[PDB]
Amino acid sequence: SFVSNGSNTSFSAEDILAKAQQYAQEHELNFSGSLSPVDAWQLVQQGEAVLVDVRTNEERKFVGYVPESIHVAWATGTSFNRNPRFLKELESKVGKDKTILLLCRSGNRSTQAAEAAFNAGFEHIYNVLEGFEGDLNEQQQRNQKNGWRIHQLPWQQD
Amino acid sequence: SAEDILAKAQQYAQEHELNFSGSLSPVDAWQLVQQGEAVLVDVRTNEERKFVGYVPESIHVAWATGTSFNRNPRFLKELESKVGKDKTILLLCRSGNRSTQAAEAAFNAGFEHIYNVLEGFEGDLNEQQQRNQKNGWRIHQLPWQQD
Known part of the structure; x- marks a missing residue:
């Protein structure tokens, strides 16, 4: 117990996250931040963020998807019916x-x-x-x- | 020539022992369809047409429907x-x-x-x-x- 200080990492996510938070404040967004696809992948591949796919099942099936993303649909179907269980899911x-x-x-x-x-x-x-x-x-x-x-x-x- | 493209497609069906009239490349299909010499029938799902895309002026007659490709019993009637x-x-x-x-x-x-x-x-x-x-x-x- 005492010798180990906990898990060790060769990757830092704080500069990408700080930049994403700066983006949200500069744009006065009502959430934590925004980041480019490349920066998002950099975090996700290292296990430092969870990639949540909010598209329809139809899009994941026929357009494609990012492996190991979690699917929580914002809207469903070809008519984009809102998913009322989005937040519960x-x-x-x-x-x-x-x-x-x-x-x-x-x-x-x-x-x-x-x-x-x-x-x-x-x-x-x-x-x-x-x-x-x-x-x-x-x-x-x-x-x-x-x-x-x-x-x-x-x-x-x- | 539409007649030449169709003849080549028919030739193709005979070399590959296909049980229909012929097969032709996307470019050859478009050449016919653009000139009104054949009907382009899209047999994909509505889901594919909506989210992947489609060829304008194609006729939608689904072979199978839904993300599960449920066989369409009305395909031939449609x-x-x-x-x-x-x-x-x-x-x-x-x-x-x-x-x-x-x-x-x-x-x-x-x-x-x-x-x-x-x-x-x-x-x-x-x-x-x-x-x-x-x-x-x-x-x-x-x-x-x-x-």
């Missing part, structure tokens, strides 16, 4: 004390979920900027301008 | 009512698997001119389990849109 699957990064298709649904979760007592809620697919282009195609996929971060589908 | 057994029909799915099954079913049901679009809208999965990286409609930069 986020609490039971993850918990209000965890460092949570919310990922949707863009930044839109994850921003809505982040505001709702922060208002409901989730202490460390962050928005992943750009989302999995990024913004639609003039040609009505996603994944050309920004997002997790264009950044060539890990993802898979069937 | 294909007959929405298009008709006498038309030149190109069946498009995600990769060619479901469109092959749909092509065989339609040809067996009396559809005279049934063709399969090779490689599908998204194409085959790569070693990283990602589609749209090797082949398919989108990698060929043919027209498509999503919301």
